[PDB]
Amino acid sequence: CNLYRMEDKDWVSKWAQDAESLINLMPAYQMNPDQMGPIVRNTADGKKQLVHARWGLPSPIFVQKKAAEARADKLKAKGKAFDINELIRMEPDRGVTNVRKLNLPHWTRWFGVEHRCLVPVTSFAEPDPASKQEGGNVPNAWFARDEAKSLMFFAGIHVPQWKSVRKVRDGLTTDDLYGFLTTDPNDLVKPIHEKAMPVLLLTREETEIWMRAPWDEAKHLARPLPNDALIILSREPYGSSIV
């Protein structure tokens, strides 16, 4: 998914009490690509930290170079000298919100325990084009554990202090990045969104496995939730926000 919400006001105490908190946790969150969202990440020090990170992992090195080359072509044809290396270096990187191919070379370097993180979520959205009207944008279907929107966790992967050009106007920056795994949609999600659904952790034992177990073990919790795990809490229009 590329849109979700986090509305649990009291969770830190029971889910991340042993985590080093150093941020001002907002009461509610409506996350969109490249925005700052709350996450509990592991540290190379073997510790945990509750911080804010930019939603969007680094793009594959070839996906980026392809953009730099395409730019170089409209520069050469335009009659302008350029540096292929400097182009790639400055090439904007929107970020990758979801990691679907676990065997993709690009992702293999960030599967160690030090790059694991828990992404708190109370409800997430999925495009619902089967409900869009003629003169209107694609609406969404919101999914949750229950009507009370019980807290859940996305299986996250973070990359601390990554230097790149997130937004052309801001230039080169060093940001903490994060993202989470996606998988095949189950019988509840597929009818609405056939592309995929997010990997969700419902219990503590599951969160511990993800935050402590070696990849060869943790990668296995990357599977769709049972068919009755979730609920369709609502169908809201494009743009609907809780904040």
DSSP string, 133-152: -TTS---EEEEESSTT---E
Which of 124-155 are b and which e, b meaning 16 or more Cβ less than 10 Å from the residue's Cβ?
bbbbbeeeeeeeeeebbbbbbbeeebebbbbb
DSSP classification of residue 37: E
Please give the domain boundaries of the chain with CATH numbers for all domains.
Answer: 1-5+121-150+183-195+223-243 (2.40.10.510), 7-58+91-120+151-182+196-222 (3.90.1680.20), 59-89 (6.10.250.570)
Resolution of this structure in Å: 2.3
Measured distance between the N- and C-terminal CA atoms of the chain, rounded to whole angstroms: 19
DSSP classification of residue 58: P
Q: Are 38 and 25 in contact (CB under 8 A)?
A: yes
128 closest CA partner among 235, 31, 232: 235
